């Protein structure tokens, strides 16, 4: 189902008459327009499907942004699959003219990834970070994801250095965090640990970050690494609500583990803390 794919990136009529019939009552439904062009695509007139797209862009009410976004995305797919690099560059271009450019960029990236033109994706990743990287964090994250996914993990860290030069300082912690989470999930968790260690070396006091850190570890489930981390946390500068909070986590963890010496060891350590 062609249309459903587009609906995912966006984040029964058997005939022309059937379709045109729906469109009378439902002119604003990108879904109808896309099924309609998909219907044609399967019969291999892509020029007919190209026409529908333009008709949809014109008929769908200008106030319905998400509906029109869908049409543009369906066209990007059209041109990327059955078109040529010049048709695509045309749609691309109009699109960023008519819709939010960064959005359109992220979408074409997604498309290249699915079509497996990785050379084309890489290049646009660099082009998009040139353009929007001064201000959008997600491009930097999305690129490091790409790079990790394609097994250049050092390149990921190179472009992370790039993102920190590009980006204001209030975005620095964030994007590093998010890279750390990346490393844990698709990357080398050691590299993520290192990144976290940095964040928490600079800001010993942002306790939300120690949390994020341990969660990643409580999720990698290396018993030691988690426990040594809990060890360190309690020795930090902590509000009683924070303190009590970490122990339940610690307890909950050892539960999912089932080592009941430690399960006890936590309840003891808690009470020792509760004294002051």
């Amino acid at each position: 189902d062609w249309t459903a794919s587009i609906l995912d990136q966006a984040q029964a009529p058997e005939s022309v008459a059937d379709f045109e019939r729906l469109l009378i009552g439902n002119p604003n439904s990108s879904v109808v327009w896309m099924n309609y062009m998909a219907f044609q695509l399967q019969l291999s007139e892509i020029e007919k499907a190209r026409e529908l797209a333009e008709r949809a862009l014109k008929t769908i009410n200008f106030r319905e942004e998400a509906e029109k976004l869908n049409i543009w995305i369906a066209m990007l797919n059209l041109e990327n699959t059955f078109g040529t690099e010049e048709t695509l560059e045309e749609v691309f271009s109009r699109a960023c003219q008519y819709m939010d450019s960064y959005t359109i960029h992220t979408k074409l990236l997604g498309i290249y990834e699915i079509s497996e033109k990785f050379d084309k994706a890489a290049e646009l990743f660099k082009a998009t970070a040139k353009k929007f990287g001064g201000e959008k964090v997600s491009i930097w994250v999305s690129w490091g994801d790409f790079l990790i996914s394609h097994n250049e993990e050092q390149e990921a860290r190179t472009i992370l250095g790039n993102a920190l030069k590009a980006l204001p300082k209030r975005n620095h912690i964030e994007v590093v965090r998010k890279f750390a989470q990346l490393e844990f999930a698709k990357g080398d968790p050691e590299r993520g640990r290192s990144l976290f260690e940095g964040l928490v070396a600079d800001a010993p006091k942002r306790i939300d970050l120690w949390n994020v850190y341990v969660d990643q570890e409580v999720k990698a489930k290396d018993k030691k690494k988690v426990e040594d981390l809990f060890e360190r946390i309690i020795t930090k500068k902590i509000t009683r609500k924070q303190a009590k909070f970490f122990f339940n986590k610690w307890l909950q963890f050892e539960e999912s583990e089932g080592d009941e010496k430690t399960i006890e060891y936590v309840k003891a350590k808690a009470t020792e803390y509760v004294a002051s």
Side-chain angles (χ1 to χ4, degrees):
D1 192 28
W2 188 71
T3 169
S5 174
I6 277 119
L7 260 17
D8 182 83
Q9 311 165 41
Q11 122 126 331
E14 313 286 74
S15 72
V16 171
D18 287 351
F19 280 116
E20 302 278 0
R21 203 136 134 197
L22 282 171
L23 290 171
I24 294 169
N26 262 271
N28 303 332
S29 172
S30 53
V31 174
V32 181
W33 284 104
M34 301 191 279
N35 292 335
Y36 192 6
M37 49 204 269
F39 163 91
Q40 293 281 348
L41 278 175
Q42 120 94 334
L43 298 153
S44 321
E45 292 95 348
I46 97 183
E47 207 72 52
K48 271 175 178 201
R50 276 181 186 123
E51 285 165 21
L52 295 179
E54 305 295 336
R55 263 183 71 189
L57 290 181
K58 282 165 182 290
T59 81
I60 301 189
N61 181 265
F62 80 91
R63 303 260 183 198
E64 297 277 50
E65 245 209 17
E67 300 290 322
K68 274 170 145 169
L69 179 52
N70 289 348
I71 295 308
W72 284 111
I73 296 179
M75 299 175 261
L76 289 174
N77 281 97
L78 204 299
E79 298 319 322
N80 174 69
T81 304
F82 313 96
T84 76
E85 64 189 318
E86 18 262 357
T87 66
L88 166 69
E89 167 62 43
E90 235 308 68
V91 174
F92 193 57
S93 230
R94 319 216 280 120
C96 302
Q97 290 279 31
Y98 288 74
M99 309 287 301
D100 177 73
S101 193
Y102 175 70
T103 302
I104 290 308
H105 279 78
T106 72
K107 300 311 188 189
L108 175 53
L109 285 161
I111 286 155
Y112 283 150
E113 290 183 348
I114 299 168
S115 42
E116 300 177 343
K117 5 196 133 175
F118 302 129
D119 83 307
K120 253 139 180 49
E123 284 306 298
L124 179 69
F125 257 127
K126 125 121 99 150
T128 311
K130 222 254 176 94
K131 229 206 185 72
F132 306 97
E135 289 133 65
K136 315 256 149 174
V137 170
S138 43
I139 183 70
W140 291 122
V141 179
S142 201
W143 204 357
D145 189 349
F146 178 72
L147 286 175
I148 287 163
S149 291
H150 289 91
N151 299 291
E152 358 188 317
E153 188 280 328
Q154 331 205 342
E155 271 308 290
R157 285 178 299 105
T158 304
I159 82 119
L160 173 59
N162 289 341
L164 288 157
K165 291 175 182 159
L167 242 43
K169 230 271 179 281
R170 48 146 174 291
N171 288 141
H172 287 187
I173 286 172
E174 163 167 24
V175 64
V176 186
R177 171 185 97 41
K178 247 134 172 161
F179 267 74
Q181 297 178 319
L182 244 195
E183 292 288 13
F184 268 90
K186 320 200 197 204
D188 180 2
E190 272 301 302
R191 260 68 158 90
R193 295 179 188 111
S194 183
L195 294 168
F196 276 118
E197 290 299 338
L199 282 164
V200 115
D202 203 37
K205 267 200 185 26
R206 289 260 325 241
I207 296 293
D208 63 291
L209 282 177
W210 287 102
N211 185 68
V212 191
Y213 193 5
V214 292
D215 264 341
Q216 283 307 295
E217 294 275 18
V218 330
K219 176 187 213 105
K221 60 211 189 192
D222 164 289
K223 200 192 219 166
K224 216 187 145 185
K225 252 122 195 186
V226 177
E227 280 154 18
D228 311 18
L229 200 41
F230 276 117
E231 277 302 302
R232 233 190 306 164
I233 296 193
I234 64 180
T235 89
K236 302 305 166 180
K237 316 190 177 173
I238 288 177
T239 233
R240 292 175 293 109
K241 330 274 171 247
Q242 286 166 8
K244 298 165 168 103
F245 169 81
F246 286 123
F247 286 106
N248 309 253
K249 221 187 208 64
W250 205 350
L251 209 45
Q252 283 171 225
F253 171 54
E254 308 284 14
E255 292 185 335
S256 48
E257 274 314 280
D259 156 35
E260 307 226 40
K261 327 179 50 176
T262 43
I263 289 192
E264 300 312 318
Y265 167 57
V266 185
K267 318 228 203 55
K269 257 252 171 197
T271 53
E272 236 307 318
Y273 206 107
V274 92
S276 59

